Write a protein that binds this ligand. Structure first.
Ligand code: A1AKT
Length: 164
């Protein structure tokens, strides 16, 4: 039910929107979370998605970490999408503010290729500290499945489109 997106490539689309509000409207098969390795959903996309689930995402995530241990930077896991989507794909992009290797951003986006269509944010951008223009270029050059990108900041959205 995706609507109002700008086509960037054969398989990549973009919209100025809060990913939480997009997930409530569309109820997609997969929503991507910008996770950390511990699945501690405090702020940014992860804190906003978790709050919209009334903390059910964090309770499920804590059980997953208690059983499996932490994810790898560049890795992912599939958990419930609760009231927002059928599934949530928690993907860990490198956090530049912590010295993590930006080359791991391509490995993070490769997780998207396991799903035919996804609603997603720009990985490693926002509070993770990487350049969003770089993140969109890695997304375009790595993901082959259909990805609908939601960018919250209007000013950044306009810059991403103009410089594409
Ligand atoms: C990742 C980053 C580039 C982006 N953040 C987001 N993008 C989309 N929905 C969101 N909900 C909460 C945060 C958020 C932004 O600052 O525009």
């Amino acid at each position: 039910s995706f609507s109002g997106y700008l086509k960037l490539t054969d398989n990549v689309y973009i919209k100025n929107a809060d990913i939480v509000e997009e997930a409530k409207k569309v109820k997609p098969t997969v929503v991507v979370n910008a996770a950390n390795v511990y699945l501690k959903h405090g702020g940014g996309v992860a804190g906003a998605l978790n709050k919209a689930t009334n903390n059910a995402m964090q309770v499920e995530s804590d059980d997953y970490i208690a059983t499996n241990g932490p994810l790898k930077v560049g890795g992912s896991c599939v958990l419930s999408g609760h009231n927002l989507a059928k599934h949530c794909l928690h993907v860990v992009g490198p956090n530049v503010n912590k010295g993590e290797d930006i080359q791991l951003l391509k490995s993070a986006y490769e997780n998207f290729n396991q799903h035919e269509v996804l609603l997603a944010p720009l990985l490693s951008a926002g509070i993770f500290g990487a350049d969003p223009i770089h993140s969109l270029r890695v997304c375009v050059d790595t993901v082959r499945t259909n990805v609908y990108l939601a960018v919250f900041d209007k000013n950044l959205y306009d810059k991403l489109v103009s410089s594409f």
